[PDB]
């Protein structure tokens, strides 16, 4: 039996208490719970989700450790995994799981989705697919991967690009291998660092506000990622307000509301375009691209290529 | 055959007059007594609410004609669902209301802006479309201005309401009617616009990770009477989130917590400060709380506003 | 608290008793009483059972002392019972089907909290007159566009071009349509006095399928063909073969699809009607009831495209 | 540029035969140097086995060529999904193969055919298009013979894998490469058809209640050496399929239990008769099962080609 470490970090879903409910885990692995935090994802920061990255990287490079599960909440789990997927230096599964329904719910999912999360972090065959966000039955890849209804169960969806894999009958089926750059493969290392660079969002939608970007760029951000309409359409309040942060040294990443999607690139208007990454996606690799360049023409290549 | 007007305010439906917009397609000719109007002209992320409040009134003059059976409005697909909204709540007629866009250029290669027009007439002049609340044609699909919303960036099949699906849909030019929203709107509306020349201001902040309060600080500081929060999951705010509503609701800011993820519930909570917005999205959401505050303040009939509009 | 009686037929949800005692949360949404009316997996659910189970609800709903129905039924072919009962159940009182993706004793089993919903639609006075309903997964689908999309998800049953007809949430109903169909109180589908139902087969399209399938099924003495088509219920130049030879036969063919959404439009080039947006399983259903009033093409296609 | 040869299965789905097609679509040739071959031409719900091997057997002969760097295939919608996925298991090249199709005639308003086959093009010719199995492009999206499937009868975006999604997209003409399928096909594939000219017969059945038992009487009586089931929920069985299904394995017949559901997974069952189709439909687990049974009619054998094609 592979060796698993679960961590929780919080959600709906003591971690000892979260083992205990679901004796079934011991038959799939050896586990051993580690309490990393405990707060509502709503409440997760960028710092806190640095040392978990941190910590699961420590975790990985031992030979005893197998895999590891993190419990999570589902409200910003797509933004803690992609950071993941992004900086951890490893081909061993690390599975983040979660539940919208709360552990006294009746019919809560938390229970499966542990079960499940263990069996595919512990299956050989999970090795090398980038963060993975198992739920309801689905194996979602970090990169695709997000809420997208506020209440269902079957709220994690990849519209466009899918599943990587589903757990049925007690089976893994695999289906794809995301072709996007990620974890042993990643530019992306944070061992060295205690904080990320600071990154806010701005909605778009009819008479958006100027003044936000102001604001924006007098708390001292280093990047702005906004939630076009369309296709990162913007105003011309808002390419005032993006001219003023880009005068200012501040990277503009125009990114959509829609959910879903490809905001093309458009020599016509300012700053870069977020290619198939969503909002909260966007501000997760801005922050880590910024950590290693201000160059527009750089930052560019890894939103199209992580 | 039908007396429609179309109404033209711009989009990639044109990217163009109105009557070249018909003229490259005449077969819409055929299936009404069309009349070209150009309203506006701009891409519609530069459309404001002082507009489409003029639009609303102007489509509320044309329905009042006994020599006009329905409108066809020409939008942009950026935020064509705003304004659709918009008159969805203000448009006192039962007569077919239509927004129609396109997602590719009228010049492009397999342009859907011409079926889409096609469609949109063929739906407006149909008698069997009255009475179902404003509509947004494309893609052979028939949408209800209160649930379609803009889910793709870039592709032809964008406008989706994944949860509550279409109101029909047009295959083999025959329209086929599945759904009556089960929501007030148009003659049913208490939303009389009348007159006015301008709405409260409504700003939309985001939710994520590291959210901060100084949004929040600004938006009240620059006298915003209401504030739509897309937020993490359902209407979930950090503790610099509950900061900054408070300081809103001292304010008399009215706080309308939507979310981020598309689709879904945003249930009651009462630990939580703010009203909540039912399944209306953030771009739905601040269209219904700015015609809300133009007739009170009370959270209590706000809040019922968005559990029945 | 209405009055809500709970018929069981069968299905992974779970006799009946034990499966009320089991969620006794839903005695506190209305005032319950169990009836088994059968036990069967839903594979097996017959027409005749069916037919039954339809004139039992009518039976029922006709008493002043009960405001609904929740029907537990197996998730392979509830989508066919329901829309049976949705185009036959003279009532505006809710009718609404239930079932469970996960067997009773598995972890997470979905089958509590789908029947408690179910229990508080079919008890909530805004849901009458809205036709037969499936309750599962926080969605209620209505059986006329509700379908099982996926083989094991919990998530299965969507209604893609239509949506649901509402959801359940934070223990609250949101509806959010109104079918715009016939159905129900507005439908002429009396089947009171039938015992019966004419023998309806449905035929898939793909490359290469054979002729003497539909040779098989006239000489079986079907009296209508369903036909799973390829696309838009397009036919190979076999299928046409043995639907011309099903007409000849005296045989009512209806052209649906295979694909799983959608029109099947009018075409005057083909032989059969079509099945408007209709899947396979609902055509079947509408096409047998269709047959005991009528074998005239123009009234039976006339049904296609309002119920 | 590269060089791309255009196979036409069927008519034009561009302008108004092959020729006509590029004549109608001239861009085409600024992506790549084309070339033109009709190799049939028929509806494609006419498209049979017989001449699906030959049109793999021609392809596989095309890209052996050092002057073709890929191909592009027009056929019909309606089964698409069965001669893509035929080739995605028997051509034995990396090379590109990219079926292209359309949803409107090409003489219609708005045809999409045009900038369908425009994206085909891009996408065979492309360099980083390689070694990703057969590919089926059309409404902006690349999908995988495996998984891609015609879900709707008449919309332009009925190509969808709902769960698996698409191998790319195609937005402002550039490709968007998302996934790479995790199964084996074209050069790691085990199917070697060259030298055959018919294939085993396999019947599709329908799962409903009351689905008839002289159905598979019928199937066995004709010689048939396989049975795809398109089964109630997850391939469940009625008492009648259990019998008719007892009888075909009696007469050496091997049933394939899939899904008629649409989507998902059949799960194995030790307590019900035949195999599963994990993921595969009706249409899909009826090609594979074709090809198995060219090699073998082991049960186990077959099962497992069905967990890795
Ligand atoms: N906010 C809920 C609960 C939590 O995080 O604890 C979630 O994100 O799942
Ligand atoms: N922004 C595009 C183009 C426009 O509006 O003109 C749209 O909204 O359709
Ligand atoms: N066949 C399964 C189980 C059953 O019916 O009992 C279902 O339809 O739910
Ligand atoms: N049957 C239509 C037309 C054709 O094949 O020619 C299709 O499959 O696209």
Same mark, same amino acid.
């Given at each position: 039996? #592979?060796?698993?470490?679960?961590?929780?970090?919080?959600?709906?879903?003591?971690?000892?208490?979260?083992?205990?409910?679901?004796?079934?885990?011991?038959?799939?692995?050896?586990?051993?719970?580690?309490?990393?935090?405990?707060?509502?994802?709503?409440?997760?920061?960028?710092?806190?989700?640095?040392?978990?990255?941190?910590?699961?990287?420590?975790?990985?490079?031992?030979?005893?450790?197998?895999?590891?599960?993190?419990?999570?909440?589902?409200?910003?789990?797509?933004?803690?995994?992609?950071?993941?997927?992004?900086?951890?230096? !490893?081909?061993?599964?690390?599975?983040?799981?979660?539940?919208?329904? #709360?552990?006294?719910?009746?019919?809560?999912?938390? #229970?499966?989705?542990?079960?499940?999360?263990?069996?595919?972090?512990?299956?050989?065959?999970?090795?090398?697919?980038?963060?993975?966000?198992?739920?309801?039955?689905?194996?979602?890849?970090?990169?695709? &991967?997000? %809420?997208?209804?506020?209440?269902?169960?079957?709220?994690?969806?990849?519209?466009?690009?899918?599943?990587?894999?589903?757990?049925?009958?007690?089976?893994?089926?695999?289906?794809?291998? &995301?072709?996007?750059?990620?974890?042993?493969?990643?530019?992306?290392?944070?061992?060295?660092?205690?904080?990320?660079? %600071?990154?806010?969002?701005?909605?778009?939608?009819?008479?958006?506000?100027?003044?936000?970007?102001?604001?924006? &760029?007098?708390?001292?951000?280093?990047?702005?990622?906004?939630?076009?309409? $369309?296709?990162? !359409?913007?105003?011309?309040? $808002?390419?005032?307000?993006?001219?003023?942060?880009?005068?200012?040294?501040?990277?503009?990443?125009? !990114?959509?509301?829609?959910?879903? $999607?490809?905001?093309?690139?458009?020599?016509?208007?300012?700053?870069?375009?977020?290619?198939?990454?969503?909002?909260?996606?966007?501000?997760?690799?801005?922050?880590?691209?910024?950590?290693?360049?201000?160059? #527009?023409?750089?930052?560019?290549?890894?939103?199209?290529?992580?």
């Amino acid at each position: 039996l #592979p060796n698993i470490v679960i961590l929780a970090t919080g959600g709906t879903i003591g971690v000892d208490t979260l083992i205990n409910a679901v004796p079934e885990v011991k038959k799939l692995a050896n586990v051993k719970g580690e309490q990393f935090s405990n707060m509502a994802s709503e409440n997760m920061t960028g710092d806190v989700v640095l040392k978990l990255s941190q910590r699961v990287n420590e975790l990985l490079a031992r030979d005893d450790v197998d895999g590891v599960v993190i419990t999570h909440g589902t409200d910003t789990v797509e933004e803690s995994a992609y950071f993941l997927h992004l900086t951890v230096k !490893s081909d061993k599964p690390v599975v983040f799981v979660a539940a919208m329904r #709360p552990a006294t719910a009746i019919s809560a999912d938390g #229970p499966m989705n542990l079960l499940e999360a263990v069996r595919v972090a512990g299956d050989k065959q999970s090795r090398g697919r980038g963060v993975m966000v198992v739920i309801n039955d689905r194996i979602g890849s970090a990169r695709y &991967i997000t %809420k997208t209804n506020a209440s269902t169960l079957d709220t994690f969806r990849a519209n466009e690009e899918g599943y990587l894999g589903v757990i049925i009958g007690n089976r893994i089926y695999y289906q794809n291998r &995301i072709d996007k750059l990620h974890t042993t493969r990643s530019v992306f290392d944070v061992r060295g660092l205690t904080s990320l660079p %600071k990154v806010d969002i701005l909605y778009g939608y009819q008479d958006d506000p100027e003044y936000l970007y102001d604001a924006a &760029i007098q708390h001292g951000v280093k990047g702005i990622v906004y939630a076009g309409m $369309g296709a990162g !359409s913007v105003s011309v309040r $808002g390419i005032a307000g993006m001219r003023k942060a880009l005068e200012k040294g501040v990277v503009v990443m125009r !990114s959509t509301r829609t959910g879903n $999607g490809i905001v093309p690139p458009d020599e016509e208007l300012p700053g870069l375009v977020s290619d198939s990454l969503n909002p909260a996606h966007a501000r997760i690799l801005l922050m880590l691209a910024l950590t290693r360049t201000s160059d #527009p023409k750089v930052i560019q290549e890894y939103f199209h290529t992580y």
